[PDB]
Chain A
């Protein structure tokens, strides 16, 4: 058959996910970071609002301050344009 290399970076989204996972994050923290990373466009701007993310979390313990802290840690991500 053809060569079928099948090797490519996932638009750094996989790189971002690995880097966030590479950084020490708690299981709940890792889940929150993964959710935040999922809410990333190709340009690098978040499609969903912080309130939308908190609603998707569906946890009474989850709050705006904790979500903002997680996003700010996520904001200073590995590559540029992670604002």
Chain B
């Protein structure tokens, strides 16, 4: 399963999720912890805005 640009929700405007009509994966908090362990703050800004 992959996605480039599909459909988002009305509630909180996020994509659907677990392959329900071309969804996407879910990012983890351990993962953002590890990213901070890398300290790529601009990467997190892209992750939270783009």
Contacts and interface: CB of A to CB of B under 8 A. Distances in A.
Interface residues of B, number: 10
Interface in B2-38: 6-11, 15-16, 20-21
A60 interface: no
Interface string A1-33: 000111111000000000000000000000000
A7 B7 contact: yes
Interface of A is mostly: loop
Contacts of A5: 9, 16, 20-21
B49 to A, nearest CB: 18
A8 B7 contact: yes
A7 B9 CA distance: 5
Interface of A: 4-9
Interface of B: 6-11, 15-16, 20-21
16 contacts: A4-B9, A4-B11, A5-B16, A5-B20, A5-B21, A6-B9, A6-B11, A7-B6, A7-B7, A7-B9, A7-B10, A7-B15, A7-B16, A7-B21, A8-B7, A9-B7
